[PDB]
Amino acid sequence: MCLKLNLLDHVFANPFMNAAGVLCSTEEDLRCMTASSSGALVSKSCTSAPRDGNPEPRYMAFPLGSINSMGLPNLGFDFYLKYASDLHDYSKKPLFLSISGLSVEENVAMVRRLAPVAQEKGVLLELNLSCPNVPGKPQVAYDFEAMRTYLQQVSLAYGLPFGVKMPPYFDIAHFDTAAAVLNEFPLVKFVTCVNSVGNGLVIDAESESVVIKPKQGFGGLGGKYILPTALANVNAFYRRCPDKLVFGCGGVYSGEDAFLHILAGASMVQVGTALQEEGPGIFTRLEDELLEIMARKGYRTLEEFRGRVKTIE
Amino acid sequence: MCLKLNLLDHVFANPFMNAAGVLCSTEEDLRCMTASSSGALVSKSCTSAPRDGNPEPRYMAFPLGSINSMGLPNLGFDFYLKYASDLHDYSKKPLFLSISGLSVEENVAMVRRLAPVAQEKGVLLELNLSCPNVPGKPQVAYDFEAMRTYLQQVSLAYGLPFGVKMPPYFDIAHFDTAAAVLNEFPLVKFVTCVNSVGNGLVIDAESESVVIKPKQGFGGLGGKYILPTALANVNAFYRRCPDKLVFGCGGVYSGEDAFLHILAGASMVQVGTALQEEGPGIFTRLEDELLEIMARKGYRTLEEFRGRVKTIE
Lengths: 313, 313
Ligand SMILES: Cc1cc2nc3c(=O)[nH]c(=O)nc-3n(C[C@H](O)[C@H](O)[C@H](O)COP(=O)(O)O)c2cc1C
Ligand SMILES: Cc1cc2nc3c(=O)[nH]c(=O)nc-3n(C[C@H](O)[C@H](O)[C@H](O)COP(=O)(O)O)c2cc1C
Ligand SMILES: CC(C)(C)CCc1c(C(=O)O)[nH]c(=O)[nH]c1=O
Ligand SMILES: CC(C)(C)CCc1c(C(=O)O)[nH]c(=O)[nH]c1=O
Fold this sequence. Notes:
Two copies of one chain form a homodimer.
Chain A: E1 5-7, E2 10-12, E3 16-18, H1 27-35, E4 41-42, E5 59-62, E6 65-68, H2 77-87, E7 95-99, H3 104-121, E8 124-128, H4 144-158, E9 162-166, H5 172-183, E10 188-193, E11 197-201, E12 203-204, E13 209-210, E14 218-222, H6 227-240, E15 245-249, H7 255-264, E16 266-271, H8 273-278, H9 282-297
Parallel strand pairs in A: 3-16, 4-7, 7-8, 8-9, 9-10, 10-15, 15-16
Antiparallel strand pairs in A: 1-2, 5-6, 6-14, 11-14, 12-13
Helix pairs in contact in A: 2-3, 3-4, 4-5, 5-6, 6-7, 7-9
């Protein structure tokens, strides 16, 4: 019975990794994730310059999940590139590097410089398509023209296989359009579904107040709130992008949640809110729990059930 | 203390009502809602002709909420109009009629016929800006030009105060654009936020199957999953539409949940999943719970805290 995966020319002991932004901002974080039982790790989404991000409190968690408006705090590209180039031990597990430039030019400049490190060390790029574009316009992945622009430019400037982190969609027309745009780009080898469910609002009844400071309390939702949304998106893209991989992210607290992602079509499975709350010990528990479900059902490998969700009739 | 209120030239004993589509399809259902302790009721969204809707199972509920792809099953406009004009007892509570024609023309045809009944009897219109998938086009409230068209045409055809049922948005630009569109129409006097969160996917781990039959298991989410989404939309529209009322819908199981909706800006508070699950007795509990929260805080009226959620600095 086996949780191993071989994909994108790397070998992974198991499908679990952190979700970008959780336990991956500092060298200490990245070493912690590397020491954990996860099968891979991804670095905090970065910008060309270091950023302090938004005022605190900017993340809060609750029994049903989390809300955040972190504002892209990060040590800057040079740091994550140096981590990839010189510090990460690839004999432990594969590394993904997430980038989230504030304009297309910023993303192009970073991917040009990551390319030789990707070639030499095998660091994998996750391009964060919830990067904000011009203020007053929707996030890039919700503006299909901008999305196409970003993927054109990045494909040309990078020239190697990469992946994209997608926000959740809620309309079949959007699944259809988004997947078609992604399918225009052969170097997009994986699609990570999903980022946080945008601009929720958590209110504390006792204090009659919002719980995070930025944006009058509005922020991205993770955790139990978003599992069915995440599963839908994983399956919508799995079905629409048959020559790509789908990585699942959202609402994973247990091997059963991970099993559902995989049935929906997930290859790798990312863990955000639950990892933030539980810490990196969660990866042993998830592995154990998933292996137990597999043993009860008689499945020996992940590919025996990946994408095999049954429909009715 | 009593929680009676005055909106849209009607008097309401309390802010609670069913959400459209729940306990409101047949004459029996409407009679049951009238006999409940709810402050108002709304009828199932109707089309010009009767519809059977989608194959069953088409609704499923779980501890954290529900998923549905009912397919607009309804008895047809003639039935709801007849209910409004001859059967409903207006001395018990106000009635809202939801319409959801499949084209602008169908909606116009229905509203022309509702107008004289709204004049004579005081039935209120909730126009549902959600529809079945049509390949190649987004849902109407997600296509801002189509939405402005529906509203121009209905406003002209109806000529009386009405409200609109909105799907959730997830992007601040979208809030700004949608609110701008609604504010073009002075007859749109209330906005109901929100309809179900579109196209989630619930999978049963034991059977490895989706749980509803239509649309390969994809359907709208309600219940606990959507409360922060619902609060965000209530508050975003309450902020952006100062000359309209906002009605909250989404994730209400307790007086505390309703309290949060009212804090975010809700005038009326609609109950969908929790009503479907618990039955019409839920309304006495919700009132009791909301009055208890008010009494412990020293609030004597809804007006004292409606829209008064606090932000941090
Ligand atoms: C504190 C925090 C920071 C995040 N930062 C990033 C980020 O830098 N880049 C990114 O793609 N997603 C980011 N996300 C989104 C997570 O990667 C993830 O998509 C989302 O939380 C959903 O998964 P979950 O339900 O496991 O939390 C962040 C989430 C949290 C809670
Ligand atoms: C079984 C079912 C039928 C529904 N039918 C309609 C409808 O006909 N018109 C409509 O505007 N919303 C309809 N909805 C959406 C609800 O009115 C409501 O917006 C949604 O369920 C969110 O509220 P909740 O969290 O209380 O369930 C329906 C929901 C359910 C669960
Ligand atoms: C949302 C952005 C600030 C534009 C990018 C980073 C990010 C953050 C964040 O740093 O605020 N939070 C998330 O939930 N998802 C993200 O992708
Ligand atoms: C979704 C439609 C079928 C387009 C309209 C009726 C409706 C339904 C429905 O009848 O399936 N379900 C909901 O969650 N919201 C709705 O507004």
